[PDB]
């Protein structure tokens, strides 16, 4: 509700192939606070994460170590009546 919204964090992660995408997904889905994650975008490299209390610092560091050169695209709150 208003004041208690989920986080929305979108990364751009240049992906070699579907194997990088699978790894991104498993990593994000095993991260504390994450509710759900999707990959889409024009290059299938937009990683949309939603959740609560996600430590984006540690998440982006892990993606950079394990997947590829992740960049922040967006940080926002989910609009929820």
């Amino acid at each position: 509700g208003p004041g208690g919204e989920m986080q929305k964090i979108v990364f751009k992660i240049p992906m070699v192939d579907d194997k990088s995408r699978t790894k991104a997904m498993s990593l994000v889905a095993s991260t504390v606070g994450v509710h759900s994650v999707a990959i889409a975008g024009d290059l299938r490299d937009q990683v949309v994460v939603v959740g609560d209390g996600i430590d984006s610092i540690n998440l982006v560091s892990a993606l950079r170590k394990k997947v590829g050169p992740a960049m922040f695209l967006e940080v926002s709150q989910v609009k929820e009546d």
């Binding site: 759900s36 999707a38 889409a40 975008g41 024009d42 949309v48 695209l73 967006e74 609009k79």
Partner: protein
């Protein structure tokens, strides 16, 4: 209009000729009402979805931009030179 003359208008990005964003409406959260499209020198970079009557921080090339949306999905922010993010209301919303 005699032969050999030329005429054009200014080249305003036309969202009606843009393919939809490759979006995924996450079933756990409210469906966002807007599409956004990011351009540099009129060349599409990427596209996505966002909420109407709302706000977000988005990385637009070399600069963070604080993007506000109105109820019709018009997007405002201090975009870096040559960049823009344009919104449209999704069909049915």
């Amino acid at each position: 209009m005699e032969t050999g003359n030329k005429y054009i208008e200014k080249r305003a990005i036309d969202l009606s000729r843009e393919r939809d964003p490759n979006f995924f409406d996450n079933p756990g959260i409210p469906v966002p009402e807007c599409f956004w499209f990011m351009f540099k020198n009129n060349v599409r970079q990427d596209a996505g979805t966002c909420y109407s009557s709302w706000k977000m921080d988005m990385k637009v090339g070399p600069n963070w931009v604080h993007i506000k949306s109105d109820d019709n999905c018009n997007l405002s922010g201090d975009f870096p030179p040559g960049w823009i993010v344009l919104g449209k209301k999704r069909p049915g919303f």
